[PDB]
Design a protein around this ligand. Structure first.
Ligand code: HEM
Ligand code: V55
Length: 403
C-alpha cells in the first residue's frame, strides 16, 4: 500500500459510478498508475500511461475480473495469440470500411426514420430510450442476424450485461463484494442462449448474409463451423458494448451540444460538422470509460511503479480523455477543439474493431434527428444524470420542441 494515496482506501464503488472524474483528476496528478482498493487493481488514468500499457509489448489483453465472470472464455477482448487472431479475422469482414460503405446508409437511415416517426410530432421525447438506444441496437441487431429480437429486449440485455460486467467492487480480502450482482448477467446470458441457439442451428445448415452466420462459416474447412461455445463470448462482447456504445456516444454528443447552444445551432445548420461533434462527444464522455484491461507478461516499470509479471492494469480511457497535458478545460464540451488524437476507441492490437461502423451509425442517427426536429431543445426542467464507471453515458435526455 502506497502511503500518500491512503485517501484511495475511502473511495467507494458508488462514488465512481455516479461521477469518477474528481477521483481521477487526483489520480492523474498524484499517481498516473495507481492501485485502487475497491477495484482490486492498478488503474491507468493518464493518456500517456493508457496508451503505453495498451500498446506495450510487455503487456497483453486480459478481461477485468467482473468482466471475465460475466463473459467467460474466449472473449475477443480477453485473449491473445492465435485465438485472438482467429476471432479478429472472424469479426472483421462486415466491419471493413469498403464493406460498411456499401450498405450502412440503407441499414441505419430507415431505422432512424422508423423510430423518429413514433415521436417527431409530439413536442417532447426522452431521447435515450426513444431514439439513441433503439437506433444503436436495431442497426447492429439486424447486421448480426437478430432481426427478430425486439429493440426493447436488446436494450434490456446490454443493461444487465453492463451491470454484471462492471460489478467490480472487492472487499477487504480482495473478494467480490457483491456476488449477487452477477445473477442478472447470468440470467441475460440464459435468455440469449434460448433465442440464439435456434438461430445458430439454422445458420449451420443454411448460411445467410448475417454476420453471425459468417462468424460460424468464414474461413472454415468445407462443411465445418466454429463451435458455438467458441463464439458465444464474443457474441456477448457485442451484446454489451457494441449494442450499447453507439447509443451512448450519440446521447453524450447531444448533451454536450445542448451545453453549448451556439454549437448545437452550428451543427443543425451545417450537418457536415456532425462527425467533428461526435469525436468531441466521445472524448468529453467516453462510452467505454474503464472497461478495458491489460496484464503484464514480464516485470515492467510503468509511471515509476515496478510491476511484477502477471499484474493487471485497468485502462481508464475516459479519464485519459480528460488529460490536461493534452486538452484545455477538458470537462467542457467544445466542438471547436482542434481535432487531436483520443483514446475512446482504445489503442494497439486490441483497439476497437468497429470504429468506422460505429461512427457512421452515430452520424446517420444525428443527421436524421436534426433533419426531423431542427428546433430540438433540451428540456431544462429535467436534469441529465450520467452514470457508470466501466461504461458511461446519460441515463436520460429529455428534450422539447415547438410543434
Ligand atoms: C461509439 C461506440 C463505440 C466505442 C466508444 C467503442 C470503444 C471500444 C474500446 C475502448 C474498446 C477496447 C479497445 C482496447 O482494447 O484498447 C473497443 C474493443 C472492441 N469494439 Fe468497439 N467501441 C464502439 C462501437 C463498437 C461497435 C458498434 C462494434 C461492433 C460492430 C465494436 C466491435 C469492438 C470489438 C470486436 C472490440 C474488441 C477488439 C479486440 O479486443 O481485439 N465496437 N471498442
Ligand atoms: C465492444 O464491446 C466491449 C468492449 C469492452 C472493453 O473495451 C468490454 C466489453 C464489451 O462488450
Amino acid at each position: 500500500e502506497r502511503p500518500d494515496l491512503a485517501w484511495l482506501d475511502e473511495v467507494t464503488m458508488t462514488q465512481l459510478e455516479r461521477n469518477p472524474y474528481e477521483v481521477y483528476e487526483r489520480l492523474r496528478a498524484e499517481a498516473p498508475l495507481a492501485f485502487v482498493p475497491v477495484l482490486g487493481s492498478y488503474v491507468a488514468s493518464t493518456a500517456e500511461v493508457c496508451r503505453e500499457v495498451a500498446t506495450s509489448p510487455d503487456f497483453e489483453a486480459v478481461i477485468t475480473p467482473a468482466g471475465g465472470r460475466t463473459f467467460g472464455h474466449p472473449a475477443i477482448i480477453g485473449v491473445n495469440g492465435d485465438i485472438h487472431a482467429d476471432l479478429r479475422s472472424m469479426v472483421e469482414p462486415a466491419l471493413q470500411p469498403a464493406e460498411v460503405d456499401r450498405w450502412i446508409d440503407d441499414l441505419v437511415r430507415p431505422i432512424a426514420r422508423r423510430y423518429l416517426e413514433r415521436f417527431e410530432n409530439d413536442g417532447h421525447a426522452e431521447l435515450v430510450a426513444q431514439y439513441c438506444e433503439p437506433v444503436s441496437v436495431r442497426s447492429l441487431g439486424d447486421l448480426l442476424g437478430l432481426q427478430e429480437v425486439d429493440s426493447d429486449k436488446l436494450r434490456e440485455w446490454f443493461a444487465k450485461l453492463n451491470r454484471s460486467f462492471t460489478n467490480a467492487a472487492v472487499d477487504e480480502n480482495g473478494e467480490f463484494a457483491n456476488p449477487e450482482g452477477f445473477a442478472e448477467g447470468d440470467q441475460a446470458k440464459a435468455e440469449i442462449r434460448a433465442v440464439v441457439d435456434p438461430l445458430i442451428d439454422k445458420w449451420i445448415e443454411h448460411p445467410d448474409d448475417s454476420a453471425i452466420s459468417h462468424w460460424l462459416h468464414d474461413g472454415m474447412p468445407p462443411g465445418q463451423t466454429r463451435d458455438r461455445e467458441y463464439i458465444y463470448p464474443t457474441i456477448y462482447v457485442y451484446l454489451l458494448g457494441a449494442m450499447q456504445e453507439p447509443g451512448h456516444g450519440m446521447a453524450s454528443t447531444l448533451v454536450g451540444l445542448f451545453s453549448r447552444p451556439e454549437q448545437l445551432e452550428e451543427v443543425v445548420d451545417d450537418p457536415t460538422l456532425i462527425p467533428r461533434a461526435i469525436a468531441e462527444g466521445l472524448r468529453w464522455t467516453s462510452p467505454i470509460w474503464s472497461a478495458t484491461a491489460r496484464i503484464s507478461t514480464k516485470p515492467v516499470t510503468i509511471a515509476g511503479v515496478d510491476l511484477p509479471a502477471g499484474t493487471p492494469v485497468m485502462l481508464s480511457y475516459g479519464s485519459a480523455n480528460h488529460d490536461t497535458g493534452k486538452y484545455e478545460a477538458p470537462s467542457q464540451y467544445d466542438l471547436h477543439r482542434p481535432p487531436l488524437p483520443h483514446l475512446a476507441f482504445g489503442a494497439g492490437n486490441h483497439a476497437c474493431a468497429g470504429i468506422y461502423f460505429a461512427n457512421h451509425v452515430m452520424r446517420i442517427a444525428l443527421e436524421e434527428l436534426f433533419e426531423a426536429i431542427p428546433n430540438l431543445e433540451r428540456d431544462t426542467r429535467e436534469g441529465v444524470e450520467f452514470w457508470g464507471w466501466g461504461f458511461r453515458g446519460p441515463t436520460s435526455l429529455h428534450v422539447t420542441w415547438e410543434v
